[PDB]
Amino acid sequence: MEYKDTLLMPKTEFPMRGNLPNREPKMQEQWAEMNIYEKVQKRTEGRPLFVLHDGPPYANGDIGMHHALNKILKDFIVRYKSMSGFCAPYVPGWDTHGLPIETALTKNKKVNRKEMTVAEFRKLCEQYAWEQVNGQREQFKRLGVRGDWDNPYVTLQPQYEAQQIKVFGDMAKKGYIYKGLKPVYWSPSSESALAEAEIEYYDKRSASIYVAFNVKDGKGVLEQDEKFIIWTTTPWTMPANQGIAVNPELQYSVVEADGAKYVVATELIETVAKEIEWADYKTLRTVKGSELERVVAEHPIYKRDSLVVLGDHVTTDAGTGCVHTAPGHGEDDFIVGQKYGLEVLCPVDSKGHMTNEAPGFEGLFYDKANKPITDKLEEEGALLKLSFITHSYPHDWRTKKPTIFRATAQWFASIKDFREDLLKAVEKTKWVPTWGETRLYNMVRDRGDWCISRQRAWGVPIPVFYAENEEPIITDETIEHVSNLFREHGSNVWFEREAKDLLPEGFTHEGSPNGRFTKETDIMDVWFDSGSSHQAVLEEREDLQRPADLYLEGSDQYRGWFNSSLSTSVAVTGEAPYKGVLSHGFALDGEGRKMSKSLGNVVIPEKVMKQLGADILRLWVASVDYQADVRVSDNILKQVAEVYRKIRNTFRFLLGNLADFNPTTDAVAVEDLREVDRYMLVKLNKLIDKVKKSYDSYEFSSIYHAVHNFCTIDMSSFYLDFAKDVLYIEAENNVERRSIQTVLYETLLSLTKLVSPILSHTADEVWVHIPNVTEESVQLVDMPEVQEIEGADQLVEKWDAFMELRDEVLKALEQARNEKVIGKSLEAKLTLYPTADTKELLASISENVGQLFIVSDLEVAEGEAPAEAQKFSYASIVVSKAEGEKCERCWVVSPTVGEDQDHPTLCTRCADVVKNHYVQQ
Ligand SMILES: CC[C@H](C)[C@H](N)C(=O)NS(=O)(=O)NC[C@H]1O[C@@H](n2cnc3c(N)ncnc32)[C@H](O)[C@@H]1O
Ligand SMILES: CC[C@H](C)[C@H](N)C(=O)NS(=O)(=O)NC[C@H]1O[C@@H](n2cnc3c(N)ncnc32)[C@H](O)[C@@H]1O
Ligand SMILES: [Cl-]
Ligand SMILES: [Cl-]
Ligand SMILES: [Cl-]
Ligand SMILES: [Cl-]
Ligand SMILES: [Li+]
Ligand SMILES: [Li+]
Ligand code: NA
Ligand code: NA
Ligand code: NA
Ligand code: NA
Ligand SMILES: [Zn+2]
């Protein structure tokens, strides 16, 4: 009414309280209308490419917090590269085959794969897959991610399957593919073989056994009264035992008597005494381990032959220097078994039940047969001690049930034949974090061959044919024929055609004179499907190239996508499929616990997406060290939401005070700016350089705190706090108010372009309220390039000290606020007694110290009388009342109020502004 004369914050087109959940979906609607991803791609069509290949997430179900972090971090890098001189094509993917889909249907939808045909079950997997890829893609958009969502890649597409066969064919012609009977992971629950990437370790209770092996033919070294000692945590492997292993040269064994003479390593006398609980024991003689070679023993239950063999695998750390050798259930047992030509026995079927090869335990599940085996051992008297231990045990990654080693005929990729080239690729790759290099390097030098065949249906079949010779037929013509056939009809054709209909039209092989061929039924590892992405996406698609610039996935992908993609590429190309790798940790509860439904700590993305929004989650991603494990909770997200409030209010302050500003020609020159404003320009450019550098180094935690510090204390509390009472009161064409606005305009333009990769819904919302809009969205302009400011270093030293001094003045004002008598910074006059250094800085102030300290008046004298007021380490201060007339417009207590006849209640400053007008109004 009468007490106010406008001069407030006009531009409220950007609301204060951020209702992003109801506003962001509309923001994404316009993004889809304009096809912004195609626009930015077209704008940079000639710029150099930065390819961030997207790791294909599984379609097992809805998205989680971990799914968001992987996509959001990818979105940060792609958006920055788009507006920094690079062309950034990002095509999303989805891994569609393998157990993660079959187990989802079996458990969630209660469908039995054995109650329907193989073709029918595959069709249901295909239907459930496209349901999940549609649901996941919409959820990713809600978070806010830019990519080729309408043209993604999936592993079920015929082009992907066709190219995957080529990858197998290229490695096969190199000789890197072979088939053999070897012990490998077997999951009885899934009735299929597995690999380390498909193995999850959990603690499991197992029965420790110390058992006796009678001596039959000591070869002049041992008498029949001696007995071997064997330690085993797998009783079910005893029926398959074909030998005993002991170290030939390093370890020497001795005979110990406790009423009977036993054979054990000398270094394990005390350890085996406390385990079997021996009372009194004595050592008879010593024997070098190599002397015990070819000694024949007897099976405790079947009294069959068991041959003592030499091996480097037997260790002192075991419970006994003698380890029972079962070539059909162990890797090291198989190697020494083949050296001595020992028979391979696997009395366990695919479902985990003992077969006729174990006479007394046929039909029993291997874990259910442990007790009967021990009972028979004690009946035979060969059992010495029975104990129980808990240790980490391999489990199926989907059924969560334990796995066992089984010696079966499987397809393998000969890693050993090109392991050296794999190690070279790791050394030549840039790994962030740095330990990722050693993580994969050790995984390569210690890895065996890769078992690729899986006894399941939903996946890409192995393209191998067998003649009447039963010889595997792998050749370029067959691979070419099946690859093109898969490109036309898909992998489904292999499961619906005879063997002769999948081969070339006139193919004949020497092994089958009658032309009767047969095909293979096993399928490929789902990690091979994801590992073939570089050939099927980076190479086939024109929008991408190989090698990609960056691979950004989780820590579990070192054994997964990182390993498989490198394995396939180096086998074919010899080089890495990526120039660099970035790794993120695991999402965790606020207390550090794993996010699982059992703990009730699950943070659903859609839950936060509707309670808080998208950019709040985007801020949280940049607020954590993604390179390690990251903690998330509702309270933590609320803290990030509070940060967005500060960013919201500071942005609104910039927009509000820039309403009556048009920098088309009202731009104050750099020299014409106030020295206070020039320092803020240097700080803005320093912030620009730090953010762009941190984007190159992917350190988003630095960016998150830098912007928060740049606004909470530097801008809102220091620079905007002063201009909160100065900008509008003065003239609308005053150089001071225009110079301050030019700083605010440049910060608004630069900061909006800076935050564009991290926050985009709020960035474009602010970009709407921009006086100069030459591009539709902030994502269409490049990042602000840093510009040097003359005399920056001198001003930085001067004004940082001035910023330091102001905070001490404010603390003195807050000390007056503690008194609360004046209770106002502007209504307070000041009498300052400064240090010579402080006085020198005040002398260097060519601006108005009173308006900077938002005080009515300031006087400086060397009074040096502390009294009882205050003294900062650089000045003595007196906060005094002015006692003049308070201006009704600027609220400054000034003696000049009443000097103007037309406006007797206004000071000279306000009276002049009200009376005069520049050109208008
Ligand atoms: C699938 C069955 C569960 C694991 C069940 N809770 C269970 O068996 N629990 S346990 O504590 O008995 N597991 C001990 C492990 O050792 C085997 N075992 C148990 N009792 C004996 C025994 N007397 N002699 C030999 N082996 C034995 C079990 O099979 C299990 O692997
Ligand atoms: C590149 C993806 C792999 C080829 C595989 N399909 C896969 O892991 N698919 S996923 O859907 O399970 N996960 C996709 C991404 O999320 C990471 N991830 C999976 N689980 C977690 C977790 N608990 N915490 C943090 N990150 C996790 C994966 O490493 C991958 O980057
Ligand atoms: Cl099943
Ligand atoms: Cl063992
Ligand atoms: Cl047919
Ligand atoms: Cl067939
Ligand atoms: Li025990
Ligand atoms: Li709060
Ligand atoms: Na059924
Ligand atoms: Na099969
Ligand atoms: Na077969
Ligand atoms: Na995984
Ligand atoms: Zn006034």
Author numbering: 1 to 921
From the paper:
Mupirocin, a clinically used natural antibiotic, inhibits isoleucyl-tRNA synthetase (IleRS), an enzyme that links isoleucine to its tRNAIle for protein synthesis. Two IleRSs, mupirocin-sensitive IleRS1 and resistant IleRS2, coexist in bacteria. Specifically, type 1 proteins (IleRS1) are strongly inhibited by mupirocin (Ki in low nanomolar range), while IleRS2, which are homologous to IleRSs from the eukaryote cytosol, exhibit resistance to mupirocin concentrations that are about three orders of magnitude higher. AARSs catalyze the formation of AA-tRNA in two steps within the same active site. The amino acid is first activated by ATP to form an aminoacyl-adenylate (AA-AMP) intermediate, followed by the transfer of the aminoacyl moiety to the tRNA.
To test this, we exchanged the natural HXGH motif in IleRS1 from P. megaterium and Escherichia coli with GXHH. GXHH-mutants showed a lack of product formation during prolonged reaction times even at 15 µM enzyme, confirming that the active site of IleRS1 cannot productively accommodate the non-canonical motif. Apart from wild-type PmIleRS1 and PmIleRS2, both of which harbor the canonical HXGH motif, we also structurally characterized their corresponding GXHH mutants, all in complex with a non-hydrolyzable analog of the isoleucyl-adenylate reaction intermediate, Ile-AMS. At the level of the overall fold, the WT enzymes and corresponding GXHH mutants are highly superimposable. However, while the binding of Ile-AMS to the active sites of both GXHH mutants parallels its binding to the corresponding wild-type enzymes, some distinctions that are mainly related to the precise accommodation of the adenine base emerged. In PmIleRS1, introducing the GMHH mutation leads to a 1.5 Å shift of the adenine base and a 2.1 Å move of Phe586, which loses its stacking with the adenine moiety. Such a distorted geometry of the active site likely results in a non-productive binding of the ATP substrate and concomitant loss of mut-GMHH-IleRS1 activity. In PmIleRS1, where no rearrangement of either HXGH or GXHH motif has been observed, the histidine at the third position promotes mispositioning of the adenine moiety, resulting in the abolished activity of mut-GVHH-PmIleRS1.
